[PDB]
Design an enzyme around this catalytic site. Structure first.
Site, short mmCIF file in Angstrom:
data_model
loop_
_atom_site.label_atom_id
_atom_site.label_comp_id
_atom_site.label_asym_id
_atom_site.label_seq_id
_atom_site.Cartn_x
_atom_site.Cartn_y
_atom_site.Cartn_z
N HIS A 279 60.35 24.61 37.54
CA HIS A 279 59.73 25.39 36.42
C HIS A 279 58.82 24.48 35.62
CE1 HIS A 279 62.62 28.45 37.38
NE2 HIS A 279 63.64 27.60 37.16
N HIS B 211 59.45 18.00 28.11
CA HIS B 211 58.72 18.67 29.19
C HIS B 211 57.51 19.33 28.58
CE1 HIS B 211 61.27 21.76 27.46
NE2 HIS B 211 60.18 22.55 27.67
N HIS C 75 54.55 22.78 29.07
CA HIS C 75 54.09 24.07 29.61
C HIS C 75 52.57 24.01 29.66
CE1 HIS C 75 58.13 25.86 28.82
NE2 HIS C 75 58.11 24.92 27.85
N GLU D 121 52.66 27.89 24.64
CA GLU D 121 53.64 28.98 24.40
C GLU D 121 53.42 29.52 22.99
OE1 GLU D 121 57.55 27.53 25.95
OE2 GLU D 121 56.86 28.89 27.54
N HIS E 215 57.24 19.89 24.56
CA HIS E 215 58.53 20.21 23.93
C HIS E 215 59.44 19.01 24.06
CE1 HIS E 215 57.83 24.76 24.51
NE2 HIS E 215 57.17 24.27 23.45
N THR F 143 62.65 29.09 25.40
CA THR F 143 61.54 29.92 25.90
C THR F 143 61.69 30.21 27.38
OG1 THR F 143 60.03 28.10 26.42
CG2 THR F 143 59.95 28.95 24.13
#
Ligand SMILES: COc1cc([Te]C[C@@H](O)C[Se]c2ccc(S(N)(=O)=O)cc2)cc(OC)c1OC
Ligand SMILES: COc1cc([Te]C[C@H](O)C[Se]c2ccc(S(N)(=O)=O)cc2)cc(OC)c1OC
Ligand SMILES: [Zn+2]
Length: 257
Positions: free
Chosen positions: A61, A91, A93, A103, A116, A195
């Site tokens: 992911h 990590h 996104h 996000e 994050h 999230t």
């Protein structure tokens, strides 16, 4: 299983994780005119001088940079927080294009990516206990925009070829997460959630106002990762972001005027 595709993406998550439609879901749009300055909020204390990074993992992911959280080595305190929150991992996104990937949004503006830094409240003893509590986690969110390179990111960028596919990990010692911070620690804060599934409502979100700059070449390397395992058809790891969720009965507070 859940993911970010047409068939298993965020609009599907509620069928296995009904808290997806809950009262304190993340991320959210930060309306900068509606956020209220809270002069009672303290400066954030980010104490990362003794951080011990261990490993980097492609989990299918995102990728996680993991830390030794068996002692108070890298902690977040102050701001909206009571007590001490230990860094466990960070990590990102990101998007398929520079105009999407974050996000959180700011007055509906999407950034190219979002960092994050995940911390857990030491009064609950371990991360798995902390995610069952409404004040269990603190996540420090930092926007990324595309411009000048971030020198402190390059050691992460250069290891990604070694963890291209789901389940791959690599040793990742002596990484200093202070090299990922902007100059200012001005922030917004609100109560929210993870999230990704399981979407638990256990997070104090702290979102920094100042983005960090990364180069186009740095984010292009993020987009060469794979969601798939080795020897499976290639599916590029892009657009691993949940869109903004309803704010409902919540107030976003600002640390700054
Ligand atoms: C590690 O031990 C466990 C872990 C878990 Te929940 C792990 C995993 O499934 C999600 Se971790 C996570 C962290 C941050 C974000 S984000 N994007 O920043 O919001 C999103 C997701 C439950 C457990 O039991 C309750 C547990 O037993 C010990
Ligand atoms: C190289 C170094 O380890 C990476 Se980034 C860094 C930037 C600033 C600070 S400061 N000025 O001590 O807050 C500490 C660490
Ligand atoms: Zn995240």
């Amino acid at each position: 299983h859940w993911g970010y595709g047409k068939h298993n993406g965020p609009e599907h998550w509620h069928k296995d994780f009904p808290i997806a439609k809950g009262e304190r879901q993340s991320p959210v749009d930060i309306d900068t005119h509606t956020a209220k300055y809270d002069p009672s909020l303290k400066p954030l204390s980010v104490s990362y001088d003794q951080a011990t990074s261990l490993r980097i993992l492609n989990n299918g992911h995102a990728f996680n940079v993991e830390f030794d959280d068996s002692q108070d080595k890298a902690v977040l305190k102050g701001g909206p927080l009571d007590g001490t929150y230990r860094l466990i991992q960070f990590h990102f996104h990101w998007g398929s294009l520079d105009g999407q990937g974050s996000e959180h949004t700011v007055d509906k503006k999407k950034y190219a990516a979002e960092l994050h830094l995940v911390h857990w409240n030491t009064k609950y003893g371990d991360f798995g206990k902390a995610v069952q509590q409404p004040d269990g986690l603190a996540v420090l969110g930092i926007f990324l925009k595309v411009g000048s390179a971030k020198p402190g990111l390059q050691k992460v960028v250069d290891v990604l070829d070694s963890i291209k596919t789901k389940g791959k990990s690599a040793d990742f010692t002596n990484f200093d997460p202070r090299g990922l911070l902007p100059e200012s620690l001005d922030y917004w804060t609100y109560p929210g959630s993870l999230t990704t599934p399981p979407l638990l409502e256990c997070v104090t979100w702290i979102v920094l106002k100042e983005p960090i700059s990364v180069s186009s070449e740095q984010v292009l390397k993020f987009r060469k990762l794979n969601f798939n395992g080795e020897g499976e058809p290639e599916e590029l790891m892009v657009d691993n972001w949940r869109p903004a969720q309803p704010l409902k009965n919540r107030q976003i507070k600002a640390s700054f005027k």
